[PDB]
């Protein structure tokens, strides 16, 4: 026989993968990296031909550690910050809207706090939301006040998705499918190597891919299986879909003391017009998309059936609504105008609703809480909408008429619409094979 | 343990609403899907809807929409089951099953639901 | 219902029957999540087996219970007095679908 070292093998495993990101703005720590080793400056991206290999993005063990690792940062940038154990007190909190309706969604709280000499107490004001106070029985008091503590991030740090690269380590490697039409699941007929992947915003977002990478120039609806209706749709665009998420309202950051050492920065009056968020997508646009959509979801159901588009279902506020960033405080669009056509056989923009809530509990994570610190003055950003996590609504005995619902919920459904295309193998460049050869005596 | 304590029986006038507690106990609350199940008292057995409790995720069904909704609450560790527009045949006893495995399965939501609670009998009559 | 179940079946103990729960090429011979369940007369339904060809936990032996194509199929061995409830076959296809019921009667 001959072993040979170095032979092409791979086989699948899973193992722990270190970062690398771009040189390019340190912002005191930014959430995404702060000590990732710098990236490969020219990425060697390795064609192969004559390869075949078994991609499954579901059962890909790639996304559950990039989970982890999101939910473990998160934690670890959110440590360090101040501490708001001492908000949980009685708000005297009142009305601020004249007028019917010319806005709720505006709390004016006036409450106690603890100043820097604990023997005095000092009368402060915020201007809270209705989503993140709930009324005691008017008082009003912080809605995450019972069931685990609020922190609030240090507003040092920010909350931009920076594109990160997760290389595997020495005796690794990442394999791409990089042809075209990829399903999901099967062989790939252009499997390529890499160091590592493209550069992954990490976006929180749900029902809308915000940001997310359109390479697929084809709307491939993917699941882990097109019959379960229970399990989420993952929808991927071709063309973007341009938004102007804006918050309208002026505010200014108003720092309250809980010191020694700690601050509290709490919303300070409107300077300007009160208003709410509007969250707007042209309406053309989004048309030929859901276009484009639907007819590549005629591909798994029957030859020509009723495709019908409605709000979410029901369920906590981070589902039935459009949860995401957009400059450094939470909130979310009901897109309940974006899920509202239905199709059978074949200038504006749409305007949605959009409810600011500083106070966010994402991920579910009862042990801790978090505050969003206020952004000073009109917060706007421009996304791109490259994904709709939808979910099928159940069926019938006659099933002429299928709903398509937006879900979303577990982010691990986020993570997967950028690491479809890869997966690591470890090498094993031990391998016997038979020779003529002989060693000598 | 395994116990699906439910609310005692209510009794309801056609064209209200009608809410109902379902507690969960002894397992974690938020891996395990809950079916809601009603059954008219003589005859066969139909459903309400599935809620996954990470996240509230819920899916109703066809002739339910409109008028069942379900929410829940994870610090207190109870299901809410909430029905509107009653009606003359709505009177029946409702059943909320736990399932069996965790929510992560591969026909985790369409499973056979092995654990049960007490039912609570609703009388909606004119 | 979208799955037909007979009305009752008869007999005495000691001898073996089966429960034909016949349905749809979509519903019992499209899938494979066919169960049957075990519902005591004034008390909620427990799960008697815990699929087609296959069986749970906290059951006897005496559930065999398969499907034959289009004809889903629950036989009972060892009949005994404990068996006298109604039993409710479940499929699965899309929307959550019961059967609409089989009593049986034993020693009876």
């Known amino acids: 026989v001959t072993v040979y070292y170095g032979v092409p093998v791979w086989k699948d495993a899973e193992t722990t993968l270190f970062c690398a990101s771009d040189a390019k703005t340190e912002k005191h720590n930014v959430w995404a990296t702060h000590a990732c080793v710098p990236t490969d400056p020219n990425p060697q991206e390795i064609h192969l031909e004559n390869v075949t290999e078994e991609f499954n993005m579901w059962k890909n063990n790639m996304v559950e550690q990039m989970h982890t690792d999101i939910i473990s940062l998160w934690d670890q940038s959110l440590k360090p910050c101040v501490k708001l154990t001492p908000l949980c007190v009685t708000l005297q909190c009142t009305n601020v809207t004249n007028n019917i309706t010319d806005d709720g969604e505006l709390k004016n709280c006036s409450f106690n706090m603890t100043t820097e000499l604990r023997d005095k107490k000092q009368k402060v004001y915020s201007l809270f939301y209705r989503l993140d106070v709930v009324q005691i029985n008017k008082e009003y008091r912080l809605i995450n006040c019972n069931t685990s503590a609020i922190t609030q991030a240090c507003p040092k740090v920010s909350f931009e998705p920076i594109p990160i690269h997760y290389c595997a380590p020495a005796g690794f490697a990442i394999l791409k499918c990089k042809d075209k039409k990829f399903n999901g699941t099967g062989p790939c007929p252009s499997v390529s190597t890499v160091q590592c992947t493209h550069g992954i915003k990490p976006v929180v977002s749900t029902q809308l891919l915000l940001n997310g990478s359109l390479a697929e120039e084809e709307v491939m609806i993917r699941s882990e299986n097109i019959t379960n209706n229970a399990k989420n749709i993952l929808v991927q665009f071709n063309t973007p879909v341009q938004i102007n998420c804006t918050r309208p309202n002026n505010n200014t950051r108003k720092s309250i003391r809980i010191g020694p050492g700690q601050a509290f920065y709490a919303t300070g009056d409107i300077i300007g017009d009160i208003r709410q968020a509007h969250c707007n997508v042209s309406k053309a646009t989004w048309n030929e998309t859901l276009g484009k959509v639907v007819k590549q979801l005629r591909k798994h159901f029957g030859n020509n059936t009723i495709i019908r588009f409605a709000n979410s279902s029901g369920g906590d506020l981070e589902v039935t609504t459009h949860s995401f960033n957009c400059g450094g405080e939470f909130f979310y669009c009901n897109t309940s105008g974006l899920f509202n056509s239905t199709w059978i056989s074949n200038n504006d923009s749409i305007t949605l609703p959009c409810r600011i809530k500083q106070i966010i509990n994402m991920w579910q994570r009862i042990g801790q809480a978090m505050y969003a610190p206020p952004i000073q003055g009109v917060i706007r950003c421009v996304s791109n909408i490259t994904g709709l996590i939808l979910t099928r609504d159940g069926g019938s005995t006659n099933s002429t008429t299928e709903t398509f619902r937006p879900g979303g919920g577990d982010m691990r459904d986020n993570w997967r619409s950028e690491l479809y295309k890869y997966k690591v193998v470890k090498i094993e460049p031990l391998g016997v094979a038979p020779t003529r050869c002989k060693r000598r005596v | 343990q395994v116990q699906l304590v439910q609310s005692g029986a209510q009794v309801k006038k056609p064209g209200a609403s009608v809410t109902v507690s379902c507690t969960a106990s002894g397992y974690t609350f938020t891996g395990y899907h809950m079916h809601w199940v009603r059954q008219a008292p003589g005859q066969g057995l139909e459903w309400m809807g599935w809620?996954?409790?990470?996240?509230?995720?819920?899916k109703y069904a066809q002739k339910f929409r409109g008028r069942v909704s379900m929410t829940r609450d994870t610090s207190i560790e109870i299901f809410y089951m909430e029905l509107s527009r009653l009606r003359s045949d709505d009177t029946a006893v409702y059943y909320c099953?736990?399932?069996?495995?965790?929510?992560?399965?591969?026909?985790?939501?369409?499973?056979?639901?092995?654990?049960w609670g007490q039912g609570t009998l609703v009388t909606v009559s004119s | 219902s979208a799955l037909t179940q007979p009305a009752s079946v008869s007999g005495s103990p000691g001898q073996s029957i089966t429960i034909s729960c016949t349905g749809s090429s979509r519903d019992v011979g499209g899938f494979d999540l066919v169960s049957w369940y075990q519902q005591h007369p004034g008390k909620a339904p427990k799960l008697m087996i815990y699929?087609?060809?296959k069986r749970p936990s906290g059951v006897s032996n005496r559930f065999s219970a398969s499907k034959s194509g289009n004809t889903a199929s629950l036989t009972i061995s060892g009949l005994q007095a404990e068996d006298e409830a109604d039993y409710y076959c479940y499929s699965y296809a899309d929307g959550v679908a019961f059967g609409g019921g089989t009593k049986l009667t034993v020693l009876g």
């Open positions: 809620i996954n409790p990470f996240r509230g995720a819920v």
């Open positions: 099953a736990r399932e069996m495995f965790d929510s992560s399965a591969d026909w985790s939501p369409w499973r056979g639901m092995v654990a």
């Open positions: 699929e087609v060809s």
